[PDB]
């Protein structure tokens, strides 16, 4: 009965029943993004990096003018260039943020940043990715905690906007994570609601079919009932093909008593996918104006 959506995101309305479930096809310039995998081998396990990408594309919206100003003053930072390669151009990503399959940012992530990750059966965490790209924090594949906030070497695969968003300053770290596995429906519900009303972009993780790596999706919207508990969430999915777009997931407490999500209602025949983690991204619009 009450629905809340991410700052800068116009709610889709074109919801139809699909093979997965209720989905509204993607349309560009609506605030939300749907980076999707080509399953070319290099990106088969990068759902977190696609999720991260989505939130970055949203970040590029919320800070457009701020960004283009920064880049004309910091042209050096415009490209990612080491080893004698030109690995990435940030201006290309912004030009192509609206594209789903061929988005020049996701192209960077799968082809240059984490190419060998899927063959190694390893993934990343969305926050780690964003913290690498923006602040230039070195990403570890074996880090199961938040990014260590300390002054450190720039990750060569990131730090585009690290002349503003520095390392070793809590004020400059834009991301946040919460373990959902230790919480019940009530606490998770309110937790999503606060972060969403606080104009943050949301990414949720859950158990997939792979035993090593969790799946991660973008949480754009959320429906809450009388009680203030999550009734349903609206998400994009890297693994879902481009024709799907915004999916409606039901949220409930399963037989096992874990909070879970699925394309269909949670029942006894439908255990759902248990929610593992929540990752948030602030737009950091105020950050550009707090340095002295």
Author numbering: 48 to 339
According to the publication:
In an attempt to better understand the structure and function of IdeC, the crystal structure of IdeC (residues 30–339), with a C94S mutation to abolish catalytic activity, was solved at 2.7 Å resolution. The crystals belong to the P32 2 1 space group with one molecule per asymmetric unit. The electron density map allowed perfect modeling of residues 48–339, whereas no electron density was visible for either the N-terminal residues 30–47 or the polyhistidine tag, indicating an inherent flexibility at the N-terminal end of the protein. The catalytic cysteine, Cys94, mutated to a serine in the structure, is located in the L-domain, whereas the catalytic histidine, His262, is found in the R-domain. Asp284 (also in the R-domain) completes the catalytic triad by forming hydrogen bond interactions with His262, orienting its imidazolium ring for the proteolytic reaction. The oxyanion hole is formed by Lys84 and the peptide amide of the catalytic Cys94. Interestingly, a sulfate ion was present at the active site in the structure, with one of its oxygen hydrogen-bonded to the Nz of Lys84 and the amide of Ser94, mimicking the interaction of the scissile carbonyl group of the substrate and the oxyanion hole, which was also observed in other related members of the same family. The remaining oxygens of the sulphate ion establish hydrogen bonds with His262 and the side- hain of Ser94. Residues 254–261 of the IdeC structure form a loop that is equivalent to the prosegment binding loop (PBL) found in other papain superfamily cysteine proteases. The PBL in IdeC, interestingly only eight residues long (in other members of the papain superfamily being around 17–18 residues long), partially obstructs substrate binding and is structured by hydrogen-bond interactions involving the main chains of His253, His262, Ala320, and Ala321 and the side chains of Thr254, Tyr255, His262, Asp284, and Asp286.
